Tab-separated table of C-alpha atoms and ligand atoms in Angstrom:
chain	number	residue	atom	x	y	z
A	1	UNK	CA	25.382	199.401	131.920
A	2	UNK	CA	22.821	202.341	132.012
A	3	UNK	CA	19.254	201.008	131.656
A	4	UNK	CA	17.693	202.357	128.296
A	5	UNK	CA	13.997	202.269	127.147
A	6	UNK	CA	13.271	204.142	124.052
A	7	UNK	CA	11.330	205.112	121.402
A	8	UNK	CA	13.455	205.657	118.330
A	9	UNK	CA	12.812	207.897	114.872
A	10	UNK	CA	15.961	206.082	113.229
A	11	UNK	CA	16.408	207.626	109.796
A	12	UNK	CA	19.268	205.362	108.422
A	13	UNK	CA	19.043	201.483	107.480
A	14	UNK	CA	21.784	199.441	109.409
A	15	UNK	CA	20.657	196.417	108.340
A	16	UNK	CA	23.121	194.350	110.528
A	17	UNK	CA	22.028	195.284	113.004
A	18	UNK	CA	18.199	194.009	112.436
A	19	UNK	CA	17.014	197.346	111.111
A	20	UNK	CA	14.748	197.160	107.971
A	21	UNK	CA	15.774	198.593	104.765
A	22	UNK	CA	14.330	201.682	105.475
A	23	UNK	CA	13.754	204.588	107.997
A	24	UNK	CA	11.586	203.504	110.517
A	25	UNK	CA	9.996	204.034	114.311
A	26	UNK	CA	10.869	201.283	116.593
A	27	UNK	CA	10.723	200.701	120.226
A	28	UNK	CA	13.612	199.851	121.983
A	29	UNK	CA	14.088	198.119	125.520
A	30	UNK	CA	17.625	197.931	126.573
A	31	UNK	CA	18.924	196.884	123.059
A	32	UNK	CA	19.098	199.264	119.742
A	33	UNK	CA	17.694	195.927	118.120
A	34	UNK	CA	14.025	197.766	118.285
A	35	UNK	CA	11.666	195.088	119.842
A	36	UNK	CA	9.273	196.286	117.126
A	37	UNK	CA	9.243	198.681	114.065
A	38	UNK	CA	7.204	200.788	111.442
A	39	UNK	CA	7.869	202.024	107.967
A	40	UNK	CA	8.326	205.706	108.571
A	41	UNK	CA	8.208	208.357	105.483
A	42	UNK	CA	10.740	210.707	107.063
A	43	UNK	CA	10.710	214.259	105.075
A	44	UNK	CA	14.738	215.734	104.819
A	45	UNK	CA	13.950	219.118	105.899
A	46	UNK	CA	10.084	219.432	107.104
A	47	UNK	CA	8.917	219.858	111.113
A	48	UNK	CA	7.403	216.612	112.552
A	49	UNK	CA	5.550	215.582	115.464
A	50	UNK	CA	6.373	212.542	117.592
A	51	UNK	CA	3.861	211.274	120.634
A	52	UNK	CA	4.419	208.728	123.216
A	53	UNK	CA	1.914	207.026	125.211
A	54	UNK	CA	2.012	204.373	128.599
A	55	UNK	CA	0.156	203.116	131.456
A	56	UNK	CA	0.465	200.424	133.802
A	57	UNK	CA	-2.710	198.688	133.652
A	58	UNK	CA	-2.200	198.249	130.045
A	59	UNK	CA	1.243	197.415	130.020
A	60	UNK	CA	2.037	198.781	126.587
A	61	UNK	CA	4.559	201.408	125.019
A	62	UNK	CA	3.166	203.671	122.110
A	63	UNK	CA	4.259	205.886	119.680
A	64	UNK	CA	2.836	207.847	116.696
A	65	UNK	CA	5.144	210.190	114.719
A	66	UNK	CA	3.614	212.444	111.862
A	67	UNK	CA	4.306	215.797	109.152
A	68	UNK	CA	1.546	217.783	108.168
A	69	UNK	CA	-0.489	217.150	105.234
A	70	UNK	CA	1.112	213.416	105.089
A	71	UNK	CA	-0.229	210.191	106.916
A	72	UNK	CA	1.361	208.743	110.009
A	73	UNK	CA	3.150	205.798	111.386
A	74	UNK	CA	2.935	204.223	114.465
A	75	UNK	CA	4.513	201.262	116.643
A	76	UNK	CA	3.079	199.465	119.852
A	77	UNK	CA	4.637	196.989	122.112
A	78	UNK	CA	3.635	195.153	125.021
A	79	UNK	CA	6.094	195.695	127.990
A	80	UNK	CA	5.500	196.150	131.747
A	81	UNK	CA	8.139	198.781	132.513
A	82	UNK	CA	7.817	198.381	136.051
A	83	UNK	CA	10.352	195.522	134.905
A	84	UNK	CA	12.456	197.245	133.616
A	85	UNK	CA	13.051	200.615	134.759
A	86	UNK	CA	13.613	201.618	138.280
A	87	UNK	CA	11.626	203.006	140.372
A	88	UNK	CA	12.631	206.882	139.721
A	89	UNK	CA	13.967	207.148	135.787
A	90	UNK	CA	14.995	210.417	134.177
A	91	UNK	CA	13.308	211.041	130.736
A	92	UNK	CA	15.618	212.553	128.142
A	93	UNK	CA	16.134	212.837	124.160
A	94	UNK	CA	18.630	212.033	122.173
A	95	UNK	CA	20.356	211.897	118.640
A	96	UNK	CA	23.664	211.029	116.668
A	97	UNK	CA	25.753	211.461	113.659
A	98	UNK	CA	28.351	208.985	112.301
A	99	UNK	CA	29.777	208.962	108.499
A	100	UNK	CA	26.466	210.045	107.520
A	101	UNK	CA	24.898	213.293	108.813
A	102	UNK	CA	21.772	215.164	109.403
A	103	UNK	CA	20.972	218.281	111.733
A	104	UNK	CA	18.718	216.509	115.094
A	105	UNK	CA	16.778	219.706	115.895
A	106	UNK	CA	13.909	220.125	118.567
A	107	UNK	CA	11.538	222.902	118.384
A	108	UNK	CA	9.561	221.940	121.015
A	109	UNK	CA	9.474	218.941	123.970
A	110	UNK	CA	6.479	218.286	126.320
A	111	UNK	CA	5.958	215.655	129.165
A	112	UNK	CA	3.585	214.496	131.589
A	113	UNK	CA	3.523	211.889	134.162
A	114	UNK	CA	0.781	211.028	136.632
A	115	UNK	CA	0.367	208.187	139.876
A	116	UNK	CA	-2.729	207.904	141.302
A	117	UNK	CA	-2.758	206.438	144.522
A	118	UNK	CA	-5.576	204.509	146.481
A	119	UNK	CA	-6.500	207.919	148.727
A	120	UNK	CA	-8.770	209.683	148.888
A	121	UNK	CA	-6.986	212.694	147.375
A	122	UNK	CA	-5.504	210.570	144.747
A	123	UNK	CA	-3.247	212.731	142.662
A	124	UNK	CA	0.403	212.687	141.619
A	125	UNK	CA	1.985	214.785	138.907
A	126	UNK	CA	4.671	216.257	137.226
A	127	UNK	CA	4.470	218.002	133.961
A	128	UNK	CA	6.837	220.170	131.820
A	129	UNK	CA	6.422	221.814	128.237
A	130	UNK	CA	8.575	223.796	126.441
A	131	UNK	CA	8.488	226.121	122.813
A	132	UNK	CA	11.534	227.481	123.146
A	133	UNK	CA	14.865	226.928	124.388
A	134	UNK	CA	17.633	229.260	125.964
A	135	UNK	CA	21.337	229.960	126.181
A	136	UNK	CA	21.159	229.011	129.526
A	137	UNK	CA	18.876	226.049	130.040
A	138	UNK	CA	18.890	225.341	133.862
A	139	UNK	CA	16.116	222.619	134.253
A	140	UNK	CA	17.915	220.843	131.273
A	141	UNK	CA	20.764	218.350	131.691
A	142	UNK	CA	22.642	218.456	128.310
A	143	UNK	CA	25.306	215.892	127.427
A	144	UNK	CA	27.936	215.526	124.832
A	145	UNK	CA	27.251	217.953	121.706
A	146	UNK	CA	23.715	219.529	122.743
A	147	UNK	CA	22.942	222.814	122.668
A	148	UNK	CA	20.009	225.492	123.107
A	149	UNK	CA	19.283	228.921	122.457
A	150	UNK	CA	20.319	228.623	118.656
A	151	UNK	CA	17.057	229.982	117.726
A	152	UNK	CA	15.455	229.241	120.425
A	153	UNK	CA	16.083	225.596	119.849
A	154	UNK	CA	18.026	222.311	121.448
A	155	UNK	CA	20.265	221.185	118.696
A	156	UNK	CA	20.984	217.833	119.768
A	157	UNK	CA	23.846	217.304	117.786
A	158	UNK	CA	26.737	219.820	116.542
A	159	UNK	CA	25.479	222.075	113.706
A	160	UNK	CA	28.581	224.470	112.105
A	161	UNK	CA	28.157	228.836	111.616
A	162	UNK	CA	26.681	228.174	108.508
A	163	UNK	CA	24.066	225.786	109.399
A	164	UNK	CA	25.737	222.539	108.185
A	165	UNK	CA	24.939	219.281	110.495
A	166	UNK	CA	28.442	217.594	111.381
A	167	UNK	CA	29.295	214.062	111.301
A	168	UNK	CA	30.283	211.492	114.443
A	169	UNK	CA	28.048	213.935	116.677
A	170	UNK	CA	26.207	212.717	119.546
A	171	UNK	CA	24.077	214.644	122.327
A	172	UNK	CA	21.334	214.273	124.893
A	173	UNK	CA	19.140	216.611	126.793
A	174	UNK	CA	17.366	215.067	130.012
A	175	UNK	CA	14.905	216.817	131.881
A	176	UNK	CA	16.174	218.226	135.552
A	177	UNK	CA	14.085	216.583	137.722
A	178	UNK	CA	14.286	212.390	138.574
A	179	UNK	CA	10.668	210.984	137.726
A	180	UNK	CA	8.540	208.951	139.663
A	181	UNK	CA	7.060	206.525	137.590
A	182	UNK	CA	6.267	203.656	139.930
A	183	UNK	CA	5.188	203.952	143.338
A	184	UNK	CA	3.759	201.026	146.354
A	185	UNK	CA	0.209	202.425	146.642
A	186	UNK	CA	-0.296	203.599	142.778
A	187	UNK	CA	-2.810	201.970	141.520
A	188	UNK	CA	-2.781	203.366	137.764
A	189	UNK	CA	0.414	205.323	136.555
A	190	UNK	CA	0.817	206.544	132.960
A	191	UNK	CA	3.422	209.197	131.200
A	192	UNK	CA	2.712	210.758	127.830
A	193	UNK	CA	5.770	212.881	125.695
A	194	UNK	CA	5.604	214.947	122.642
A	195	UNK	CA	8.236	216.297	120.771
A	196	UNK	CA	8.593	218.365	117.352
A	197	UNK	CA	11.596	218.131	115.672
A	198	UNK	CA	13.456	219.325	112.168
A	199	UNK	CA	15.762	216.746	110.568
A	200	UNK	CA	17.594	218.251	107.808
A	201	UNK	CA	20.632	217.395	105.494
A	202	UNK	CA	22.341	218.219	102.736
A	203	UNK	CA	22.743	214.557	101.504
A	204	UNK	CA	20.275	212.045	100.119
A	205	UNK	CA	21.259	209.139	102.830
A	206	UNK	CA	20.876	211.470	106.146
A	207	UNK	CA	21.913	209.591	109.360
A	208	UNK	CA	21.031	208.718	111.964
A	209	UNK	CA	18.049	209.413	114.420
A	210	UNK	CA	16.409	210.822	117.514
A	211	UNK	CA	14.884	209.203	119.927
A	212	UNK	CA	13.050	209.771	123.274
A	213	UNK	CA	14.344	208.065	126.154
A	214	UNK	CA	13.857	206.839	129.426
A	215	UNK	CA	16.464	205.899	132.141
A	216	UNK	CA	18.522	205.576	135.304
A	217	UNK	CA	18.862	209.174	136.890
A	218	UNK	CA	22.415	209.050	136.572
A	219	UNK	CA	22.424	207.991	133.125
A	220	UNK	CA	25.197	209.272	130.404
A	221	UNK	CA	25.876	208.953	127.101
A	222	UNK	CA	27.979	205.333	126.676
A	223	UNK	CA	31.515	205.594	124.993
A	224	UNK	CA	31.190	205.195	121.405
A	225	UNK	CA	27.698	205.563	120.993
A	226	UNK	CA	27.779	207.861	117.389
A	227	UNK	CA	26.426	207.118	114.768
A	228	UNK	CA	24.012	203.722	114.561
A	229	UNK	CA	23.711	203.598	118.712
A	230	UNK	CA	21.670	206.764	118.770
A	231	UNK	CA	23.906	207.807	121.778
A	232	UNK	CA	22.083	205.393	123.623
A	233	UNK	CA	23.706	201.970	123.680
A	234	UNK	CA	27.613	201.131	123.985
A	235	UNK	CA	27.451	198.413	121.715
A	236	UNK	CA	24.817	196.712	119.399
A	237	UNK	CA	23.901	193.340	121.144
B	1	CA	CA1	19.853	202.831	112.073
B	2	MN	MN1	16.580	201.033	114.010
């Protein structure tokens, strides 16, 4: 029931679920069954960088995710979102744990969206970056097992004392404030996120993802979504 669009960094293969037998970016829109995917050589333990990119006159979700000193992958689909978001959407990340485990930290989360009307002063925006994280997070909404301020960070999922990512975790951070990312008089509107994050684990099959999300301001995290739903879907249709 929540409205989902996403961009996912999915680390473990559920292949009945349509994933390939391998990590992978995909984009998703309203279904964990990623509309389209990419190989991705995830690195257990090494900071990455994901981007997203969108505008309405091309009608087309991005994505480029890369480590230093290795190549990149990236994953396009065509999708007009005024479709298939509302009008106002929050914009949020997420991750989850199931039988298989990883740590889903983020070192750093940036956004920017932008309307431009017909006027003659044109200009609509709303932007947001942040390096670090606090205790006490008050333009964050967290959900589930997120955190912040463990070294500076947002620890999506739980992580023990000792540093250990736990199993059947699943959390979300959305930003504070609704975004407007369609609007009667706009006549180009576009959004662009970047994230860094540290995926770490102990094992040699970590599981199972981040991703970056958009959705309904009121949106929560569905029952049962550990695990292979990313903490974004209540089932896998
Ligand atoms: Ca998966
Ligand atoms: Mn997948």
């Amino acid at each position: 029931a929540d409205t989902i669009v996403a961009v996912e960094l999915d680390t473990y293969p559920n292949t009945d679920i349509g994933d390939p037998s391998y990590p992978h970016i995909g984009i998703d829109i309203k279904s964990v069954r990623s509309k389209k995917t990419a190989k991705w050589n995830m690195q257990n333990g090494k900071v990455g960088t994901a981007h997203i990119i969108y505008n309405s006159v091309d009608k087309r979700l991005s994505a480029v995710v890369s480590y230093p000193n290795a190549d990149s992958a990236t994953v396009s689909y065509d999708v007009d979102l005024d479709n298939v978001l509302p009008e106002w959407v929050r914009v949020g990340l997420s991750a989850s744990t199931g039988l298989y485990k990883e740590t889903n930290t983020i070192l750093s989360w940036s956004f920017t969206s932008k309307l431009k009307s017909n006027s003659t002063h044109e200009t609509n925006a709303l932007h947001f970056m942040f390096n670090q994280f606090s205790k006490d997070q008050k333009d964050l909404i967290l959900q589930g097992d997120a955190t912040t301020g463990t070294d500076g960070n947002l620890e999506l999922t739980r992580v023990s004392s000792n540093g250990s990512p736990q199993g059947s975790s699943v959390g979300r951070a959305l930003f504070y404030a609704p975004v407007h990312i369609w609007e009667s008089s706009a006549v180009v509107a576009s959004f662009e996120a970047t994230f860094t994050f540290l995926i770490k684990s102990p094992d040699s099959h970590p599981a199972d993802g981040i991703a970056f999300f958009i959705s309904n301001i009121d949106s929560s995290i569905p029952s049962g979504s550990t695990g292979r739903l990313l903490g974004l879907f209540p089932d896998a249709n």
